[PDB]
Amino acid sequence: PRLYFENRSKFIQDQKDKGINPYPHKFERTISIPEFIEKYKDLGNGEHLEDTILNITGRIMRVSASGQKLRFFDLVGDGEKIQVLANYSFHNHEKGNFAECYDKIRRGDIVGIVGFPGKSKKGELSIFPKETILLSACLHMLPMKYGLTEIRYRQRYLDLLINESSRHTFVTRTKIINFLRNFLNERGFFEVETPMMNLIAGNARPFITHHNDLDLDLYLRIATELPLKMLIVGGIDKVYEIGKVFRNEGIDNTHNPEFTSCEFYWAYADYNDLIKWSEDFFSQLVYHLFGTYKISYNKDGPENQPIEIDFTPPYPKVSIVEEIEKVTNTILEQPFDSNETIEKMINIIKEHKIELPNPPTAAKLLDQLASHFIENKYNDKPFFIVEHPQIMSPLAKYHRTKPGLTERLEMFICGKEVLNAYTELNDPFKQKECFLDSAFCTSLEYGLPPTGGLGLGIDRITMFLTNKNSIKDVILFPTMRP
Amino acid sequence: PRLYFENRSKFIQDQKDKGINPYPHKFERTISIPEFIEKYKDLGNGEHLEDTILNITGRIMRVSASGQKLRFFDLVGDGEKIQVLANYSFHNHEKGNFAECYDKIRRGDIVGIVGFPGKSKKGELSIFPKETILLSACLHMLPMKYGLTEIRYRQRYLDLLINESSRHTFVTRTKIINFLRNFLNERGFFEVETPMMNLIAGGANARPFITHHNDLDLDLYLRIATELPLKMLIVGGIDKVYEIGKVFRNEGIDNTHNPEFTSCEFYWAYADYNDLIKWSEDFFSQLVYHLFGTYKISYNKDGPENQPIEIDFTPPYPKVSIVEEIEKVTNTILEQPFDSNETIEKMINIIKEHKIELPNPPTAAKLLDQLASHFIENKYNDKPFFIVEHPQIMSPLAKYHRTKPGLTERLEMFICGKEVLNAYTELNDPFKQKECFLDSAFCTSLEYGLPPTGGLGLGIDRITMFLTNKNSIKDVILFPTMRP
Numbered sequence: 001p002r003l004y005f006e007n008r009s010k011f012i013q014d015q016k017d018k019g020i021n022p023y024p025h026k027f028e029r030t031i032s033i034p035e036f037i038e039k040y041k042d043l044g045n046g047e048h049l050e051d052t053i054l055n056i057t058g059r060i061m062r063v064s065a066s067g068q069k070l071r072f073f074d075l076v077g078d079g080e081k082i083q084v085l086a087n088y089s090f091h092n093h094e095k096g097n098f099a100e101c102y103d104k105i106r107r108g109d110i111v112g113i114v115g116f117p118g119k120s121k122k123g124e125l126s127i128f129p130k131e132t133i134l135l136s137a138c139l140h141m142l143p144m145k146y147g148l149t150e151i152r153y154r155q156r157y158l159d160l161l162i163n164e165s166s167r168h169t170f171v172t173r174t175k176i177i178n179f180l181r182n183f184l185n186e187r188g189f190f191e192v193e194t195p196m197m198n199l200i201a202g203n204a205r206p207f208i209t210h211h212n213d214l215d216l217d218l219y220l221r222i223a224t225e226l227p228l229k230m231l232i233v234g235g236i237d238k239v240y241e242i243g244k245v246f247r248n249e250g251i252d253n254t255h256n257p258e259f260t261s262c263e264f265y266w267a268y269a270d271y272n273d274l275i276k277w278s279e280d281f282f283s284q285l286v287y288h289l290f291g292t293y294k295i296s297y298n299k300d301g302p303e304n305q306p307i308e309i310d311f312t313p314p315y316p317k318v319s320i321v322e323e324i325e326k327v328t329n330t331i332l333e334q335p336f337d338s339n340e341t342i343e344k345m346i347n348i349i350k351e352h353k354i355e356l357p358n359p360p361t362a363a364k365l366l367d368q369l370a371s372h373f374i375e376n377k378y379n380d381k382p383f384f385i386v387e388h389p390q391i392m393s394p395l396a397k398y399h400r401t402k403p404g405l406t407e408r409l410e411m412f413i414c415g416k417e418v419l420n421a422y423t424e425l426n427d428p429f430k431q432k433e434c435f436l437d438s439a440f441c442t443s444l445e446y447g448l449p450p451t452g453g454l455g456l457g458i459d460r461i462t463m464f465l466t467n468k469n470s471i472k473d474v475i476l477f478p479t480m481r482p
Numbered sequence: 483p484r485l486y487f488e489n490r491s492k493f494i495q496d497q498k499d500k501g502i503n504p505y506p507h508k509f510e511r512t513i514s515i516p517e518f519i520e521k522y523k524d525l526g527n528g529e530h531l532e533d534t535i536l537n538i539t540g541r542i543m544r545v546s547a548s549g550q551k552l553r554f555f556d557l558v559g560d561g562e563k564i565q566v567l568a569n570y571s572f573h574n575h576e577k578g579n580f581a582e583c584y585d586k587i588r589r590g591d592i593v594g595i596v597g598f599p600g601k602s603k604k605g606e607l608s609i610f611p612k613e614t615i616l617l618s619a620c621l622h623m624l625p626m627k628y629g630l631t632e633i634r635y636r637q638r639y640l641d642l643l644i645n646e647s648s649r650h651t652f653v654t655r656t657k658i659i660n661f662l663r664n665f666l667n668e669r670g671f672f673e674v675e676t677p678m679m680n681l682i683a684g685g686a687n688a689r690p691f692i693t694h695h696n697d698l699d700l701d702l703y704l705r706i707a708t709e710l711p712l713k714m715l716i717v718g719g720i721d722k723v724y725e726i727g728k729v730f731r732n733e734g735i736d737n738t739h740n741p742e743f744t745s746c747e748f749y750w751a752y753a754d755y756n757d758l759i760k761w762s763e764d765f766f767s768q769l770v771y772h773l774f775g776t777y778k779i780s781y782n783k784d785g786p787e788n789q790p791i792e793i794d795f796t797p798p799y800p801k802v803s804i805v806e807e808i809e810k811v812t813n814t815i816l817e818q819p820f821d822s823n824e825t826i827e828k829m830i831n832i833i834k835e836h837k838i839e840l841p842n843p844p845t846a847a848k849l850l851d852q853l854a855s856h857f858i859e860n861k862y863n864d865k866p867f868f869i870v871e872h873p874q875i876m877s878p879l880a881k882y883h884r885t886k887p888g889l890t891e892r893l894e895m896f897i898c899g900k901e902v903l904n905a906y907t908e909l910n911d912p913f914k915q916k917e918c919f920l921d922s923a924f925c926t927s928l929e930y931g932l933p934p935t936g937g938l939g940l941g942i943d944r945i946t947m948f949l950t951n952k953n954s955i956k957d958v959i960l961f962p963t964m965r966p
């Protein structure tokens with residue numbers, strides 16, 4: 001209970017009163033635990049190198065029987081575990097009594113060990129201490145290795161120490177990001193940094209904050225799209241950024257207020273080049289992590305059967321306007337925001353009984369029509385939704401053959417959007433929103449070269465590559481209410 | 483005037499009416515301007531590669547005399563420029579008349595050129611078109627060289643297109659961040675992402691940006707530092723963890739302070755102050771040598787018109803204790819407790835005696851920081867120097883000094899009198915943390931055992947300032963924050 005904390009807290013006072021520093025300043029580690037393994041993992045059983053004295057650190061995760069001559073411990077560090085065999089014969093009695101300097105070590109304590117490598121006669125690789133010091137004691141009681149359950153979200157430090165699956169989840173998350181950064185850097189791109197506080201944000205509700213020195217409300221950025229396109233006008237033909245974006249929307253299993261995004265912009269490249277980029281990226285991404293393009297994902301949870309997602313390119317391409325016109329057997333007349341087609345789309349929303357968006361705009365009705373009849377159609381492999389109407393794509397260049405549409409693409413995994421790209425609209429006259437930042441509109445008048453931009457959802461991508469059902473499991477500290 | 487813009491807009495709709503698209507969708511270029519230089523720079527004067535047809539792009543930056551046989555253009559791309567030599571003879575007339583297909587081209591136009599490489603007989607490397615197509619027209623009149631002087635901040639695309647000093651400046655900024663990232667990555671460090679919005683301010687001394695989450699009905703503070711969540715990740719087992727990102731302080735705006743700026747904080751288990759001193763000296767010396775080939779650089783401290791100073795980055799760097807030198811330059815004896823009304827009285831009498839701008843509020847920590855900002859920080863301007871052994875009153879999250887009472891094992895590196903580094907060994911005992919009788923989540927994380935850790939913080943925007951020879955913070959940020 002709280003009793004264990006009260007006992008360990010006053011033990012720290014005892015050692016302080018006995019002239020011992022329970023939190024010493026420096027302990028010179030001469031080898032880490034993973035490095036300890038590789039250097040001595042092929043030693044014989046019972047073979048001791050008693051004449052190679054190491055200095056090792058780590059956390060105690062298991063204390064064994066208190067045999068008054070042999071002590072067994074578990075030293076875990078950097079995600080890997082070794083054994084500690086404290087023998088009275090090998091212990092240095094010059095610094096303290098053997099039984100006295102080991103009965104005080106509880107499970108969870110950070111210790112510093114001076115010893116030599118070797119293997120047990122059983123066959124377990126162990127470090128044999130001649131000297132053991134407490135570096136940082138654990139006042140509370142650590143849970144068992146299967147005791148975590150939303151504590152993993154608030155006390156993430158416990159979740160990283162107890163559940164082995166949690167570390168792997170984040171060792172691969174930053175590997176997905178590092179692979180993405182190298183993928184663009186090796187193709188001649190340019191990582192930059194665009195501001196997060198502006199005067200207008202540019203489908204999102206804005207986080208409003210106030211600057212006290214300037215006395216003006218600033219919108220937290222919802223997308224790094226506009227300032228990156230302004231950098232394309234500036235000459236930076238291949239630019240990207242990987243940072244946090246903000247949505248003041250709802251919180252559920254696949255949405256978070258802040259979330260990691262990546263947007264690159266490619267000069268003189270178009271919609272066809274963006275499809276090839278995503279096919280090359282995701283295929284090599286999952287092959288870099290797994291040695292294969294087919295991955296297993298549990299859409300229904302770990303208790304149920306998983307599905308197989310094949311990442312072998314190419315991926316299916318599906319036009320949104322056509323399949324909405326097929327699965328519903330309807331014909332939508334352009335313009336889609338006419339008072340007749342708007343009513344016709346609402347009629348389909350009420351027949352098939354779907355949550356009608358609020359308010360009923362032709363863009364939201366088309367998006368809602370695609371979210372039910374198209375998105376959750378193909379789950380065993382990623383696919384693109386292509387050629388969105390310009391009523392749904394204000395900054396996407398008009399389609400070069402079919403009127404009313406654009407050259408847009410959205411890739412989905414298990415029916416969730418993880419990618420958004422299109423050929424960038426560069427005509428300032430065809431951009432009617434410019435009669436949006438007025439600084440962006442002015443930058444279009446200075447000449448935006450034919451550009452293709454693409455946006456990636458880092459958190460959702462990491463979810464499906466780690467077999468996770470909730471976005472709270474790919475973020476170290478998800479924002480919640482105390 | 484703006485009539486140039488009106489005529490270019492009328493020109494661009496008339497071209498649409500004549501059946502031509504002024505903004506085409508895709509042009510398949512097969513070589514970039516830097517590649518064009520790298521491949522054909524070592525050519526003979528007047529030599530033509532008559533059989534290699536290249537498709538090249540770029541922005542037109544100079545339009546010369548409209549002679550009806552030869553046309554000279556300056557085509558720039560990715561910070562480098564080649565010449566365009568359009569000859570009437572070489573022009574494919576089946577696509578249009580030579581004079582008509584080139585009178586439309588204005589300075590600033592993004593064009594796609596199909597031609598062959600070579601040099602003019604005068605020695606200029608050029609591209610010889612046989613057809614040129616407008617990809618994106620520039621409707622406004624572009625300014626001249628160094629025609630910009632705060633328009634360069636509000637229209638950074640103009641600043642990147644005209645003067646090469648800033649494209650070189652921001653390429654150096656990305657190189658500094660890329661070098662730092664690979665510097666930590668090579669040493670087994672682990673880059674993560676901590677939340678940017680939390681519930682309490684913690685890590686430094688500043689004012690936070692306040693925002694409201696609607697569907698959570700809670701007010702969240704924008705993070706002033708990543709110090710608290712990263713130390714929690716040290717307890718989690720990740721012994722070498724760091725993060726690079728933005729941080730927010732609702733303070734003033736001047737030449738060395740910006741509302742949001744880039745920060746980097748790493749935490750290294752089983753390392754203390756000494757290990758961080760060696761880290762700081764090895765990082766800065768290697769970074770400067772990696773960027774310049776020497777450890778000595780020149781910086782214009784107070785403008786490009788005045789005398790600049792030379793900064794030597796050869797390790798090691800001087801170490802200066804804050805209380806030790808505040809006592810020697812003011813020939814006063816300030817002893818502990820520093821927050822006592824006797825020491826506070828003597829410190830504030832030094833403030834009046836030297837006509838010093840008093841801090842607000844004049845706490846023992848802010849009085850001590852202002853005294854160092856007036857008597858120690860503006861000292862060593864020929865070499866970066868460390869401010870060492872700060873009192874515990876100015877360091878709530880720093881471990882007590884192992885041999886000097888009332889102090890912490892803290893270090894602050896200063897370049898030209900401006901703080902660019904903050905580091906100390908981490909206070910790992912929850913009992914000596916006064917606020918943990920900050921967040922209760924960070925206090926509870928300390929209870930579960932924080933190994934002896936050394937943490938450090940870097941001001942990326944201030945570092946790129948002194949390494950790109952810039953005087954203001956607005957010159958190292960792409961889109962600095964400013965009001966209409």
Ligand SMILES: CC[C@H]1CCCN(C[C@H]2Cc3cc(O)cc(O)c3C(=O)O2)C1
Nearest residue numbers: 247249255256259261417420455456457
């Ligand atoms: C920038 C790249 C985008 C491409 C398309 C896909 N989109 C996904 C984004 C949508 C979203 C909305 C929201 O209110 C909250 C969220 O946490 C998220 C989220 O986590 O993911 C990323």
Ligand SMILES: CC[C@H]1CCCN(C[C@H]2Cc3cc(O)cc(O)c3C(=O)O2)C1
Nearest residue numbers: 731733739740743745901903904940941
């Ligand atoms: C990265 C964390 C600190 C380490 C030590 C150095 N310090 C310097 C920091 C101070 C500051 C305050 C402010 O309100 C606004 C600013 O733009 C800046 C700035 O750019 O630099 C950063």
Ligand SMILES: N[C@@H](CCCC[NH3+])C(=O)O
Nearest residue numbers: 223225420421453454455
């Ligand atoms: N800003 C888009 C991604 C980039 C689209 C291409 N400019 C989004 O929020 O999905």
Ligand SMILES: N[C@@H](CCCC[NH3+])C(=O)O
Nearest residue numbers: 686707709904937938939
């Ligand atoms: N977070 C500190 C810098 C790092 C201190 C050492 N952990 C700051 O705000 O300056």
